[PDB]
Scaffold this active site. Structure first.
Site, PDB file in Angstrom:
ATOM      1  N   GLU A   1      87.999  32.049  44.838  1.00 40.97           N
ATOM      2  CA  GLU A   1      86.981  32.875  44.726  1.00 40.97           C
ATOM      3  C   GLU A   1      86.385  32.710  42.780  1.00 40.97           C
ATOM      4  OE1 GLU A   1      86.552  37.052  46.572  1.00 40.97           O
ATOM      5  OE2 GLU A   1      85.314  35.049  46.193  1.00 40.97           O
ATOM      6  N   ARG A   2      85.873  33.903  41.851  1.00 34.71           N
ATOM      7  CA  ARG A   2      85.802  33.495  40.779  1.00 34.71           C
ATOM      8  C   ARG A   2      86.516  33.167  39.985  1.00 34.71           C
ATOM      9  NH1 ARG A   2      83.549  37.270  43.362  1.00 34.71           N
ATOM     10  NH2 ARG A   2      80.908  37.940  43.184  1.00 34.71           N
TER      11      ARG A   2
ATOM     12  N   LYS B   1      87.265  44.032  48.336  1.00 33.95           N
ATOM     13  CA  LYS B   1      87.899  43.360  48.567  1.00 33.95           C
ATOM     14  C   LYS B   1      88.820  43.130  47.804  1.00 33.95           C
ATOM     15  CE  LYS B   1      85.647  40.590  50.862  1.00 33.95           C
ATOM     16  NZ  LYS B   1      84.315  40.378  50.013  1.00 33.95           N
TER      17      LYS B   1
END
Ligand SMILES: Nc1ncnc2c1ncn2[C@@H]1O[C@H](COP(=O)(O)OP(=O)(O)OP(=O)(O)O)[C@@H](O)[C@H]1O
Ligand SMILES: Nc1ncnc2c1ncn2[C@@H]1O[C@H](COP(=O)(O)OP(=O)(O)O)[C@@H](O)[C@H]1O
Ligand SMILES: [Mg+2]
Ligand SMILES: [Mg+2]
Lengths: 421, 50, 539, 141, 53, 141, 53
Positions: C180-181, C154
Site C-alpha cells: 500500500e501507500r 478499508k
C-alpha cells in the site's frame, strides 16, 4: 555499428538552473536559451523515501479552483489524480494550479514557495508552446520547469520524462522547498512503455500492457512525499493526469493509478456541457488526506457545502417535475443549485483561497438565496467586488473565520447589491 | 384518467420493451467482443513465450 | 561454488551455477551490488540456471556479477526482539532504531500446519462496530476480509479495528503492510507511538506490535514476499510462544498482483484477466498458514482491494473461500454518506449460525437483512413514483429500513481527524437491542436522520431532541441585538493593524547552498580500458 | 461419517492434487455403485478443479482456449460426471448420483466452466443471492 | 500521407506561405502500418494494432 | 445464363477457394470491362469471403484484430471492389458494376466487415427484416 | 456426426432412398470441433470457435 557504454545509469540535470527552462525528456533544453548552467546531474530512478523519512500531510496546497479547494482539498505532499475523459478540463485544472502558485509565491516567505514542474508526455509541440506562452504571459515560468517529451519523440523518451521530470522536482523536495509536479497524460506514458516493451518481446498482458505497468506508476508516484523535519521538511505534490475512454475508469491504467494516488478529481463530459466548469463530479471525487490539510474557514464552510450537495444529488432524478412542488425538497433543490453555480469558475483565473471561502460563506449561510439560479456567477462578482477588501486581509492572516470576523462579514454581505430581486 | 393511464402504460411498456430489445442486442455484442478481446490477449501472450 | 548473473530482465534475474544449484525458494545474495540485493530462486531453468525474483531493484546488475547462495530461504528475525520495530521484506530494520534482537532467525517459507492440528472453535470477536457485530460477527481465531474498491474505506476500517481490537488484547499483533501507500504506513507508525502501542527506545519490549512494510514503491519481488515475512513473525508467536496473535494484512490483493507483475517474465503463459496461472495456488499457500492451530491463535484481518468495484475479478473472488467473515464494503453505501460503507446484504460470516451466536442475535440480524432486501425490492417503484402507492402496509417497512441504514452508520475514533465527530464504541448487547427496536417498532416516531452517525440507541434519542430544539432556534437568533457590530466584536479598520505583517523576501533562497557540476556538452563514453573518454569522431 | 468419505484437496495442496481429487473421490464412490449399493458424491467447487487443471495446462504449455482454459476442459468434467450412473440389474443395479457445485460470478451462467457443466448434468439447482437475503433459505430459484 | 505532407512542407518551409492540407482518411495510414507490422515480426498491441501506433 | 457466368465456391470448398472466387469472378467480368462492353458482378456474401479469409489468417498464425479478423480484411474487399470501374473513352468506355452482398446479424450495420464495405462501395441497399416480415418485399429501408 | 452421415449416405447412394439423419445437438458437433482445433494449437476465431467454423 559500435555501441559504447557510458558507465552511467540515466541522469538528468537537477538544480536551480532548470527553473524557467523547457527541457526534453532527458534534460536537454529545447527552448533555445543555451545549456543549463546552475545544475548538477542526479539519477532518474531514485528510491522513494521510506516510512521514517516522511511526516503527515498538514499544510495545504491551494489550487485556486473553488471546487477543489472546498470539496477535494489537497495538501502539500499528496498525490491527487486528475482523471476524466478527453477535453473535460484536466489540463486546465492543473494549469490553474501552476498559475496560482505564482500568485501565492509573491506573498509568502522563501520556505513557503511552491516550484511547479509540468511534465508533458505525448502531446504536440503546438500545445506545449501554447503553455510556455501562457506561463510566460502570467509570469509562472520563473517557478516552473517544463519537461516536454512530445508525440514525435521516441517512446523511451516519453517513458522517461515523468521520471526525469520528477528527479528535477525532487531537488526542491530534498532541499526543504516545496514542489508540485504535474504528469500530464500518464496514460500516454504507459502507451509509450507498452510499445517499448512489446518490441523488447516482453510478453503482453491486459490490453497488451506489460506486467509491471503498476510498478511503472507506483515507483513514480510514491516519490511525491512530505518529508520529515530531519530531512529538511520539503514536499513534493504530484498531479497525475489519466485520460479515460467514455468514462470507463475500470480500464487497466486508470484502475492502477486510482489505487496508487490518494485522492482523485473526477471530471465528467456531461457535467462539462451542463455549464458546470470545472466539471468536477462531487460524488466520485475523493481526497484521502481530506480536511486534515484544508484551509480553516474554508473547512468551516465546506461542511455545509458538502452536505447540501449530497442532498441536492439525491433530490435529482426527481427534479423533472416542477409541477410537483414539495417545498422541502424544493428548498434544497434550489439551495444546492446556488452551490452548484457557486462552484463554477472561468479558466486561467485562479482565485485566492480567502476570496473563495467568503463566496462559499455567502451561499451556505443563505445570503444568495434571493438571487435566481441563473445569475450567481455575476452575484459572486457582486460579493467580491463590493465588500471591504480588508475582510480578505485579516482572513488570510488569522487563517480562520474568527468570532470577531463572522459578524463583521455578516453585515458586510448585507451592504452589497446582489443581481436578483 | 384511468383510461388514459391504461393507454399511457401500453405505450410505456411497449417503449421499454423496444428499448430492452435494443439493450440485449448491444449487450450480446459486447459479450461477444469481450470474449474475443480476452482470447486475443491470451494468444498474444502465449505466442510471445512459445 | 558461487553463481554468476547471466540475464537481467526487469525484476527477474537468471543466475548460472556451475555445479550445485540452489533449491527453489532459496535466497541468494548478489555480491558487489550497492544496496543489499537479495534474489529468491523461483525455478530451475534447465542449463545450470535458476530464475529469480529480486527483493530490491536490479538497476546496476552486470552479467557476470557474483551471486552467493545462502543455502536457505529468506530468513527474518522473529521473537520479542521485533516488537515495536519496522521490518523489511528481508528482515531488515527500516525504523532507524538500530539492529533487531533475534530470539530466532526463521525462514519465511513454511508448510501449512496440517489437517490434524486445526482448532474447530467458533467464538465471537466483539469489534465495537454496529454493522459488523450485528450482520457479520467476526470469529476470535479466524480469517476476516474487508473487500472494497479504491476509496470506500478499508484502510480506515482496518485502522478502527487496530484500536478497537488490538488495543485491548492480551497477545501481540503484527501489521503486514503489503504493497500500500508509504504515507499511510508512516501514519500508522506515528499513530502507534502516540497511542503507546509501539514504545521507542528503552521501553521497546513493552511494545505490542511488529510492523512489516512492503509498500508500493518496492519491486514486485518485495511485495510478493512481505506478506510471508509478516506471517513468519506471527507464526513464531503462535507456535513457539503459543499465544493469540493478531495479523492485520493491508491489501492482500497486492500479494497476488506482485506475483502477476513477474510471472510473464518467469516464463508463464497468461491465465485469465491478467493474472498468473498459479493464482489460486500462490494465494492458497499463503492463507492456509494464517490459521488457529492447537498451539496458538492468529485472528487475521485482511483488507482486499477489489479492482474497479468488481467482485467477480479473480483476485478478490479467490480469496472469498479463505475467510470466515467477509466484510464487503460498497461504493453505493458511501455515496449515501453512510460510514463504514459495509454492504449489509453482501457481508457474510460463518459466525451467523444460531448455534454459535444464539437465536436472539440471529433473528435481529436476519430480520435486518430481510427488511433491507425488501426496501431494495421496493426502490423499483418508490424511486419512480414517490411512496404513495403502497397503502401503508410497506410504506412502514421503508421507514423502518431507512432508519436501519442510518443506524448501521457509526462514527469512528480514527475518523475524528477526518470528520468533526467523536468516536463511538458500541457494545454487542447494546447493538442487538438498538436494532431489535427499529426492527419491531419501539422507535417508530423518531426521525430518520437522528439515527445517522450515532453511537447506540440512547444516542438517537439524545440526537432527536437536539433536532427539535434547534428547529425552534431558527425563529429568533438573528436580530432584536445579539449579533451586532457593537456588542462583542471590534472594528474592521483596527483589525488590519492587529495582524503581524510577515516579511516577503522575493529572492526565494535557491542557489545560496547549491553545489553545482559542469555539464559536458559532448558525450563521455568508455574505451576498452574503462576510461571516460569523449565519444570518438569515428561514426 | 459412518457412511461418508471425505476426499480433501485443500487450497495449499498442489494443483495436480486438486485436479485429481474429484477423480479420486469418484473411484471411492464407484465401489458402492459397482457392488450393488448406492453412492452419492458431492464435488464441492468443481469450478476450483477447473482452475487447478488450467494451472497445470498453462504451465505445461498447452494451448489456451477461452478464459485460458485448455481445450479438453469439457472432456475433463464430462469424463468425471458420466461416471455417475444408474447401472442395470445385470451389473447389480447399483447407482452413483453426483452433485457438482459450480460457483458463478454475479449469476453469470454463460461463463465457460458453468456452461460446460450445465451441458453435462441433468439439471441445475440455482441459488440466487437476492432470494437469499429475501428470507428464502434455501434460496432455490 | 508523407508524400503529400512533403509537398505541403515545401510550400511552408521554402515558399513560406500558408497552405491547406486536406488528408482524406489519415486512419488509412494507421491501418496500413497495422497490416505491415503483422509481417514485420511484432507482438500486437491492443485491439490488433501495431505496438508503435 | 446466355449472359451469366457462375463462379461457385460453396461451403464444402476450401477456404482459399472461397477467398479466391470473388477475384476469379472479377477477372472474368473485367474481360468485358476492358474490351468496351459492360459487366455486372454479384459477389453474394462477401460476408463469407472474409470468414474464409479470416480462416486462412488464423491458420497462418497471423495476429487478429476486430472480431478476430486480420488487419488486411479491409484491403481484401478494397482490392476487389475497386476493380468495378467505369473506364474512360481512351480505355474503351467499358464498365463493371458490382453488387457486393453483406449479411448482418441483428440489423447491426456497425459490424466490422459491414462498415468496411460501406466505406468502400458507393451506395447501399439496406434490406430490412421488419419490413420483410410485414410482407413489404423488396424490403427496402 | 460423419459416421452417422456415412451410414445415411449408403441408403442414399446404394439403396437409393430418402433418409432422415438426426444429428442430436448440432451445437455439440460445433463445440467438439472447437476443442480439437484448440488441441491442435490453432488460434481461435471470434467468440472462441475454431478458425474453420
Ligand atoms: N473551467 C473552465 N471554464 C471554461 N472552459 C474551460 C474550463 N476548463 C476547461 N475549459 C476548456 O474546455 C476545453 C477542455 O480542454 P482542457 O484544457 O480541459 O483539456 P483536457 O480535456 O483535460 O485534455 P485533452 O485536450 O487531452 O482532451 C478547453 O477548450 C478549455 O479551455
Ligand atoms: N468511517 C469513515 N468515516 C468518514 N469517512 C471515511 C470513513 N471511511 C472512509 N472514509 C473516507 O473514504 C476515504 C477512503 O480512505 P481509505 O480507507 O484509505 O480508502 P481505501 O479503503 O481505498 O484504502 C477516506 O479518505 C475518507 O475520506
Ligand atoms: Mg490535457
Ligand atoms: Mg488503503
Amino acid at each position: 555499428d559500435l555501441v559504447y557504454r557510458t558507465g552511467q545509469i540515466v541522469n538528468v540535470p537537477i538544480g536551480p538552473g532548470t527553473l524557467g527552462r523547457v527541457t526534453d525528456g532527458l534534460g536537454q533544453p529545447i527552448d533555445g536559451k543555451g545549456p543549463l548552467t546552475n545544475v548538477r546531474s542526479s539519477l532518474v530512478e531514485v528510491k522513494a523515501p521510506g516510512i521514517i523519512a516522511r511526516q503527515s500531510v498538514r499544510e495545504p496546497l491551494f489550487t485556486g479552483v473553488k471546487a477543489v479547494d472546498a470539496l477535494v482539498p489537497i495538501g502539500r505532499g499528496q498525490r491527487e489524480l486528475i482523471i476524466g475523459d478527453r477535453q473535460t478540463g484536466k489540463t486546465a485544472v492543473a494549469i490553474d494550479a501552476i498559475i496560482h502558485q505564482k500568485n501565492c509565491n509573491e506573498q509568502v516567505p522563501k520556505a513557503q514557495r511552491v516550484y511547479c514542474v509540468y511534465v508533458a508526455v505525448g502531446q504536440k509541440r503546438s500545445t506545449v508552446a501554447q503553455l510556455v506562452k501562457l506561463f510566460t504571459q502570467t509570469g509562472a515560468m520563473r517557478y516552473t520547469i517544463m519537461v516536454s517529451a512530445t508525440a514525435s519523440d521516441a517512446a523511451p523518451l516519453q517513458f522517461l520524462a515523468p521520471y526525469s521530470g520528477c528527479a528535477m522536482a525532487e531537488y526542491f523536495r530534498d532541499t526543504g522547498k516545496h514542489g508540485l509536479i504535474i504528469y500530464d497524460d500518464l496514460s500516454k506514458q504507459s502507451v509509450a512503455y507498452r510499445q517499448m516493451s512489446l518490441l523488447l518481446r516482453r510478453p503482453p498482458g491486459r490490453e497488451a500492457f506489460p506486467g509491471d505497468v503498476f510498478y511503472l506508476h507506483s515507483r513514480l508516484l510514491e516519490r511525491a512525499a512530505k518529508l520529515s523535519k530531519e530531512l529538511g521538511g520539503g514536499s513534493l505534490t504530484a498531479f497525475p493526469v489519466i485520460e479515460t475512454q467514455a468514462g470507463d475508469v475500470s480500464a487497466y491504467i486508470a484502475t492502477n493509478v486510482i489505487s496508487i494516488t490518494d485522492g482523485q478529481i473526477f471530471l465528467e463530459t456531461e457535467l462539462f456541457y451542463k455549464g458546470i466548469r470545472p466539471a468536477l463530479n462531487v460524488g466520485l471525487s475523493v481526497s484521502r488526506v481530506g480536511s486534515a490539510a484544508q484551509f480553516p474557514g474554508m473547512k468551516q464552510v465546506a461542511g455545509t457545502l458538502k452536505l447540501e450537495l449530497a442532498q441536492y444529488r439525491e433530490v435529482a432524478a426527481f427534479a423533472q417535475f416542477g409541477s410537483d412542488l414539495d417545498a422541502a425538497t424544493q428548498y434544497v433543490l434550489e439551495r444546492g443549485a446556488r452551490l452548484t453555480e457557486m462552484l463554477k469558475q472561468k479558466q486561467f483565473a485562479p482565485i485566492p483561497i480567502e476570496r473563495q471561502t467568503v463566496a462559499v460563506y455567502a451561499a451556505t449561510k443563505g445570503f444568495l438565496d434571493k438571487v435566481r439560479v441563473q445569475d450567481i456567477v455575476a452575484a459572486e462578482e457582486a460579493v467580491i467586488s463590493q465588500v471591504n477588501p480588508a475582510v480578505f486581509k485579516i482572513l488570510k492572516a488569522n487563517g480562520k473565520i474568527t468570532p470577531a470576523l463572522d459578524a463583521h462579514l455578516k453585515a458586510e454581505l448585507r451592504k452589497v447589491k446582489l443581481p436578483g430581486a | 384518467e384511468h383510461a388514459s393511464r391504461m393507454s399511457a402504460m401500453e405505450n410505456s411498456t411497449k417503449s421499454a420493451g423496444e428499448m430492452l430489445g435494443k439493450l440485449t442486442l448491444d449487450y450480446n455484442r459486447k459479450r461477444q467482443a469481450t470474449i474475443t478481446t480476452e482470447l486475443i490477449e491470451i494468444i498474444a501472450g502465449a505466442s510471445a513465450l512459445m | 561454488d558461487a553463481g554468476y548473473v547471466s540475464q537481467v530482465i526487469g525484476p527477474v534475474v537468471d543466475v548460472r551455477f556451475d555445479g550445485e544449484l540452489p533449491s527453489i525458494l532459496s535466497s541468494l545474495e548478489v555480491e558487489g551490488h550497492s544496496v543489499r540485493l537479495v534474489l529468491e530462486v523461483a525455478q530451475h531453468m534447465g542449463d545450470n540456471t535458476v530464475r529469480c525474483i529480486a527483493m530490491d531493484s536490479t538497476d546496476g546488475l552486470v552479467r557476470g556479477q557474483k551471486v552467493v547462495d545462502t543455502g536457505s530461504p529468506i530468513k527474518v528475525p522473529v521473537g520479542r526482539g521485533t516488537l515495536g520495530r519496522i521490518m523489511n521484506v528481508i528482515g531488515e530494520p527500516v525504523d532507524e532504531q538500530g539492529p533487531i534482537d533475534a530470539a530466532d532467525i526463521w525462514s519465511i517459507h513454511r508448510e501449512a500446519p496440517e489437517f490434524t492440528e486445526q482448532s474447530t472453535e467458533q467464538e465471537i470477536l466483539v469489534t465495537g462496530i454496529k454493522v459488523v457485530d450485528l450482520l457479520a460477527p467476526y470469529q476470535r481465531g479466524g480469517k476476516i476480509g474487508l473487500f472494497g474498491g479504491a476509496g470506500v474505506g478499508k484502510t480506515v476500517l482496518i485502522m478502527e479495528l487496530i484500536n478497537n481490537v488490538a488495543k485491548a488484547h492480551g497477545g501481540f499483533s503484527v501489521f503486514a503492510g503489503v504493497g500500500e501507500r508509504t504515507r499511510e504506513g508512516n501514519d500508522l507508525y506515528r499513530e502507534m507511538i502516540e497511542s503507546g502501542v509501539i514504545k521507542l527506545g528503552a521501553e521497546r519490549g513493552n511494545s505490542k506490535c511488529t510492523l512489516v512494510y512492503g509498500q508500493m514503491n518496492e519491486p514486485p519481488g518485495a511485495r510478493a514476499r512481505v506478506a510471508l515475512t509478516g506471517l513468519t513473525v506471527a507464526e513464531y508467536f503462535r507456535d513457539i510462544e503459543g499465544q493469540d496473535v493478531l495479523l492485520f494484512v493491508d491489501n492482500i490483493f497486492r500479494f497476488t498482483q506482485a506475483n502477476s507483475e513477474v510471472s510473464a517474465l518467469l516464463g508463464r503463459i497468461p491465465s485469465a484477466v491478467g493474472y498468473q496461472p498459479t493464482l489460486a495456488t500462490d494465494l492458497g499457500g499463503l492463507q492456509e498458514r494464517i490459521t488457529t492451530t492447537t498451539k496458538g491463535s492468529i485472528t487475521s484481518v485482511q483488507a482486499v482491494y477489489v479492482p474497479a468495484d468488481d467482485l467477480t475479478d479473480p483476485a478478490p473472488a479467490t480469496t472469498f473461500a479463505h475467510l470466515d467473515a467477509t466484510t464487503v464494503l460498497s461504493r453505493s453505501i458511501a455515496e449515501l454518506g453512510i460510514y463504514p460503507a459495509v454492504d449489509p446484504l453482501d457481508s457474510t460470516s460463518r459466525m451467523l449460525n444460531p448455534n454459535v451466536i444464539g437465536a436472539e442475535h440471529y433473528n435481529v440480524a436476519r430480520g435486518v437483512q430481510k427488511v433491507l432486501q425488501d426496501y431494495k425490492n421496493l426502490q423499483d417503484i418508490i424511486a419512480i413514483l414517490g411512496m404513495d402507492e403502497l397503502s401503508e402496509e410497506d410504506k412502514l417497512t421503508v421507514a423502518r429500513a431507512r432508519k436501519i441504514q442510518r443506524f448501521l452508520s457509526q462514527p469512528f475514533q480514527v475518523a475524528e481527524v477526518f470528520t468533526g465527530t467523536p468516536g463511538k464504541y458500541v457494545d454487542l448487547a447494546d447493538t442487538i437491542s438498538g436494532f431489535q427496536g427499529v426492527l419491531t417498532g419501539k422507535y417508530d416516531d423518531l426521525p430518520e436522520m437522528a439515527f445517522y452517525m450515532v453511537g447506540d440507541i440512547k444516542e438517537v434519542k439524545e440526537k432527536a431532541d437536539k433536532m427539535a430544539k434547534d428547529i425552534a432556534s431558527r425563529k429568533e437568533a438573528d436580530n432584536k441585538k445579539v449579533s451586532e457590530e457593537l456588542k462583542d466584536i471590534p472594528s474592521l479598520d483596527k483589525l488590519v493593524s492587529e495582524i503581524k505583517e510577515v516579511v516577503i523576501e522575493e529572492d526565494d533562497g535557491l542557489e545560496e547552498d547549491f553545489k553545482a557540476e559542469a555539464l559536458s556538452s559532448e558525450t563521455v563514453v568508455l574505451n576498452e580500458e574503462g576510461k571516460s573518454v569523449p565519444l570518438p569522431k569515428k561514426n
